[PDB]
Design a protein around this nucleic acid. Structure first.
Length: 859
DNA sequence: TGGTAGGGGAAGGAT
DNA sequence: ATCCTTCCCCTAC
């Protein structure tokens, strides 16, 4: 009618096949149906914003020498209209002088200058980025995308409500959405802020595949999906997290179903669809996605395998209307990039989201359900699924398996709160939520700065087509065991505070660059960090209120977590070499100040006649030689106030006291963290950092025994009795290994691949790659980059190195000639872990520990 | 398609 | 054989 109000969620831009158009996809309220439906708004006529920086004097391009003719704003306009717009076939365009700010990597560019803003249609040819001219030295905005221009010009900071003044009917239906509208010019789209976000339609799904006998390509056997139609991002997840479901199952070419599938299913009353051929199955799933019309599709291992196979089978089987997997009608699918295949619908891979929120040995679905959902997952081998087609009782269990997998995925998504958190991360950064779910953290802070400099009238850098600088300072530790109270001080968010304290920005230094006059106004980068900290503070104050909605404290918690996660990732965007806002000088300047701030702090504490024993990037550990917390906390604040007297915004605080400390090496120690109580007298928990028992590349047999040793060293017992308890247990573990009392899960060590196992220089050298190649030889799910492979080295009767004798745990039970190397774990795993832990404590030796396990003492 | 600093292991030369 | 550098993966900040 007069206006069109909708809540945008995703955007799609086709740079090559349709330039200057940005498709928006979101929700809109239909009062007649009393439900939100999917809508697609087509924003047309996105201009090409260019900026020509005029030279001081007109020079000839061939000679490159000064001709002595001054360059004016009319002369630079002449060269474009005469020699540039004609040579590159730019018929119609616009021109207007403007003043833009700049503070980035291109040299010989003033901070403030007069540029020639030129706007023309995106359907016209694009200029070269390195274009030079007789009147202008450089040109910006050459390859700026339509989506970027639209999001910046209209201040679209994340998913929000938009009004579309003067909406237009679409000639032919371009989208798979319920409602469609068109915008003539980007100026017709504004941001509405006083409206609550709408619930979303979420669909988590899973699928089971199988390799064909003739061709090695996969084949979709069964798919299941759970749907919830009012999944709110503003509050907790619904219980149950799904309202409806559908399950599909088909046959391969040379396979037929067990008897009476329909009747038995009709008898079981389970809502299961039977497809004759796989092509019939895919058409059913596409039509279900089209009718459900979800905003977010959830699954596991989507980009690595599942989505790539789904598109491939649809292409092979020639299933009609492939583009229904997204929301925009398209004639042909891209080659399998390919992330822009489900445009209009967000893709959530729980295995990817888990890698950003939690820490696990392996991030496959089976391991996630064991750690998050506290329930075991049974997986069907890809070799036994062919025999599962013999009896329907074995095949109906196959559907129930994948159907239960879809529920696990949906349950994992809810427990991690990835949807409510991703929206907050997107509304803070001001990017696209689909990119937040999948893309890295670099693209987010890239958008946060692209907005910040657009707000302040800056020309942002164009999108480009060992280490590199010094980092933190780790003081050398005073190795040993400490019986007295150890005090730990550190600076909260040092690098963000360093930026504010010293006004470090692209604009404040002459980037080589050194800190500016403290009288200078706060730069753009520090002022943005100041906002996030102030915003996080205000949210913290809101959590203090009483008589408040119990659902708000959970949402306020999600928000304040996002504010910190954004402010802390700001530094990393400066050191990333492929970052749009790459500034290695600024990154080195920050890290240098951190070292100087730490070094000056350590020397200040030493001048106070205090002994510092360890210090990492921002922390300092002080040995007090006192057993009274009244004097430790008094001395804790005395050092605190003395340090904070030097910095305006940077502050240091007590991070806890240590009852006992086992400081082994750099970044490796164990302590008993003092926790204050209402009684005024502490209770202690242990903290493990850097020790081999904390890592995941050591077996659980050595990590559990080492954790028992750490508990004995930090214990409040006599020195003569601690060594007795370790002896009695270290000889016991040496007996249960050869006796077989310990499970096989205690012998597996986990290492992940940083590249493809075939792309390694030598696979027989590294153990985990040799096991990865064996998994890739089987029919089971492949092991690609980033995947963690658990392996158990065995005894195959060969005198090859213990690393060359590395096998998979599944090979130990299958092959009877592979047995657990008993002497290896007692000498190469359990011994060095316990030996390095007991190195500073007097009494336990390396050879004495080896004699306890039961091996030839040579140490 | 955040960073550097650092430990602990094994491979692969050179000797 | 041993010494040494290189590469590997995982950590702490």
């Amino acid at each position: 009618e007069q206006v069109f109000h909708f809540y945008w969620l995703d955007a799609y831009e086709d740079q090559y096949n349709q330039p200057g158009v940005v498709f928006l996809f979101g929700k809109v309220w239909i009062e007649s149906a009393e439900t939100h439906v999917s809508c697609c708004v087509m924003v047309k006529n996105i201009e090409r914003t260019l900026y020509f920086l005029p030279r001081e004097m007109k020079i000839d391009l061939n000679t490159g020498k000064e001709t002595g003719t001054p360059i004016s704003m009319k002369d630079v306009y002449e060269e474009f209209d005469e020699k540039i717009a004609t040579k590159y076939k730019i018929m119609k365009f616009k021109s207007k002088p403007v003043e833009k700010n700049y503070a980035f990597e291109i040299p010989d560019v003033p901070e403030k200058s007069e540029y020639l803003e030129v706007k023309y249609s995106a359907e016209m040819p694009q200029l070269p980025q390195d274009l030079k001219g007789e009147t202008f030295s450089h040109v910006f905005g050459t390859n700026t995308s339509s989506l970027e221009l639209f999001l910046m010009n209209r201040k679209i900071k994340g998913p929000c409500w938009l009004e579309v003044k003067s909406p237009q009917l679409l000639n032919q239906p371009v989208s798979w959405c319920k409602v469609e509208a068109m915008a003539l010019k980007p100026d017709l789209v504004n941001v509405i802020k006083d409206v609550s976000p709408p619930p979303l339609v979420v669909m988590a799904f899973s699928m089971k595949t199988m390799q064909n006998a003739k061709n090695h390509q996969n084949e979709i056997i069964a798919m299941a999906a759970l749907v919830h139609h009012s999944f709110a991002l503003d509050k907790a997840a619904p219980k149950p997290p799904f309202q409806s479901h559908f399950c599909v199952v088909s046959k391969p070419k040379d396979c037929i179903f067990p008897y009476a599938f329909k009747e038995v299913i009709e008898k079981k009353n389970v809502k299961v669809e039977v497809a004759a051929t796989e092509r019939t199955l895919l058409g059913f799933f596409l039509a279900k996605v089209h009718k459900i019309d979800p905003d977010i599709i959830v699954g596991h291992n989507i980009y690595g395998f599942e989505l790539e196979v789904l598109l491939q089978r649809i292409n092979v089987c020639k299933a009609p209307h492939w583009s229904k997997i997204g929301r925009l009608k398209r004639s042909n699918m891209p080659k399998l990039g390919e992330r822009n295949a489900t445009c209009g619908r967000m893709i959530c891979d729980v295995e990817i989201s888990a890698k950003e929120l939690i820490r696990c040995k392996s991030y496959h679905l089976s391991e996630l359900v064991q750690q998050i959902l506290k329930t075991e997952r049974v997986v069907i081998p890809m070799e036994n699924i062919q025999n599962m087609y013999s009896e329907s009782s074995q095949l109906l269990y196959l559907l129930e398996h994948t159907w239960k997998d879809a529920k696990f995925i949906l349950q994992i998504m809810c427990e991690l709160n990835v949807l409510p958190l991703a929206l907050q991360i997107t509304n803070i950064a001001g990017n696209i939520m689909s990119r937040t779910l999948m893309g890295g953290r670099s693209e987010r802070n890239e958008f946060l700065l692209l907005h910040a400099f657009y707000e302040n009238n800056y020309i942002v850098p164009d999108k480009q087509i060992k280490a590199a600088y010094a980092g933190g300072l780790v003081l050398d530790p005073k190795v040993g065991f400490y019986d007295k109270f150890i005090l730990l001080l550190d600076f909260n968010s040092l690098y963000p505070s360093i930026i504010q304290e010293f006004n470090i920005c692209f604009t404040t230094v002459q980037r080589i660059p050194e800190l500016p006059d403290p009288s200078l106004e706060m730069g753009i980068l520090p002022r943005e960090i100041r906002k996030l900290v102030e915003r996080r503070k205000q949210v913290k104050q809101l959590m203090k209120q009483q008589d408040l909605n119990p659902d708000l404290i959970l949402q306020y918690d999600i928000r304040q977590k996002a504010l910190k996660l954004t402010a802390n990732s700001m530094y990393g965007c400066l050191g990333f070499s492929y970052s749009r806002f790459y500034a290695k000088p600024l990154a080195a300047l920050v890290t240098y100040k951190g070292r100087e701030i730490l070094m000056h702090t350590k020397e200040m504490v030493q001048k106070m006649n205090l002994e510092v024993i360890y210090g990492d990037t921002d922390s300092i550990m002080i040995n007090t030689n006192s057993t009274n917390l009244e004097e430790v906390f008094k001395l804790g604040n005395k050092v605190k106030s003395e340090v904070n007297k030097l910095y305006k915004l940077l502050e240091i605080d007590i991070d806890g006291v240590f009852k006992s400390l086992l400081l082994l090496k750099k970044k490796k120690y164990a302590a008993l963290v003092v926790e204050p109580t209402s009684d005024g007298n502490y209770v202690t928990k242990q903290e493990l950092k850097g020790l081999d028992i904390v890592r995941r590349d050591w077996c659980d047999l050595a990590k559990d025994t080492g954790n028992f040793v750490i508990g004995q060293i930090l214990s409040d017992q006599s020195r003569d009795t601690i060594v007795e308890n370790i002896q009695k247990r270290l000889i016991e573990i040496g007996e249960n290994v050869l006796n077989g009392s310990v499970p096989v899960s205690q012998f597996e060590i986990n290492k992940a691949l940083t590249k493809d196992p075939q792309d390694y220089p030598d696979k027989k050298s590294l153990p985990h790659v040799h096991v990865a190649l064996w998994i890739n030889s089987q029919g089971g799910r492949k092991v690609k980059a980033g995947d963690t492979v658990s392996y158990v080295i065995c005894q195959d009767g060969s005198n090859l190195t213990a690393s060359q004798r590395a096998y998979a745990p599944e090979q130990l039970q299958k092959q009877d000639n592979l047995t657990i190397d008993t002497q290896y774990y007692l000498a190469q795993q359990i011994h060095p872990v316990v030996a390095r832990i007991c190195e500073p404590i007097d009494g336990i030796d390396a050879v004495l520990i080896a004699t306890w396990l039961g091996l030839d003492p040579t140490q």
